[model samples]
Target: TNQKTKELSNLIETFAEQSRVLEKECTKIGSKRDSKELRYKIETELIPNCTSVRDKIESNILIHQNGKLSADFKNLKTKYQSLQQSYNQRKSLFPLK
Candidate 1:
């Protein structure tokens, strides 16, 4: 339960919140360009950051809440990945030519 562990756990929680927001926005906008860009940002940047922090906390800390936080983050990562795939599939169908 060191300072770094606590900081990362907090960050994971924030990212989870942001991921949910982004998922909702993506769904609302559907396959529009802006929505696709947001999806890219979440998948390439935000989700990776969340995953990295979760991995660090799980591996480095012996904190009591580490297991719960890690599980939540892992679940978020999986859901984000699924949304990314669906967005990419829809994006591919957009008329680019």
Candidate 2:
């Protein structure tokens, strides 16, 4: 059980790193789909570990009270907006001529 917990923690860290990398790439290259994939991975993988970690540390702590976790979600929202904008720009760049 301890090993599993450790593994989850490591996974969470990895996902966080991935999120950062994706954000950087999106900013640099304006790649919407790549950013979206990273954001989705964070939502599905990292969040669960974060919740579990919270539960493990404070058995009674509500998952919603985790500000860091909330920040992560907020970043995802920001990333989504950026992605949308980039995608729109790319589409508009298509010339009808």
The sequence of per-residue lDDT tens digits that candidate 1 reaches over residues 1-97 is 6686667667667757756755665464344455545656666775566566556545645434577656766776677677656656655555333
Q: Enumerate clash totals for all models, in the order shown.
A: 0, 0
**lDDT, candidates in the order shown:** 0.60, 0.44
Q: Compare the candidates by lDDT and give the number of the best one.
A: 1
lDDT tens digits, residue span 31-92, model 2: 44434444445445544444444344334232135555444444543554455455345434
Estimated TM-score per prediction? 0.57, 0.35
Weakest 10 consecutive residues, lDDT, candidate 2? 54-63
Best by TM-score: 1
Candidate 2, pairs of clashing residues: none
Q: Candidate 1: TM-score?
A: 0.57
Give the TM-score comparing model 2 with the true structure, all chains together: 0.35
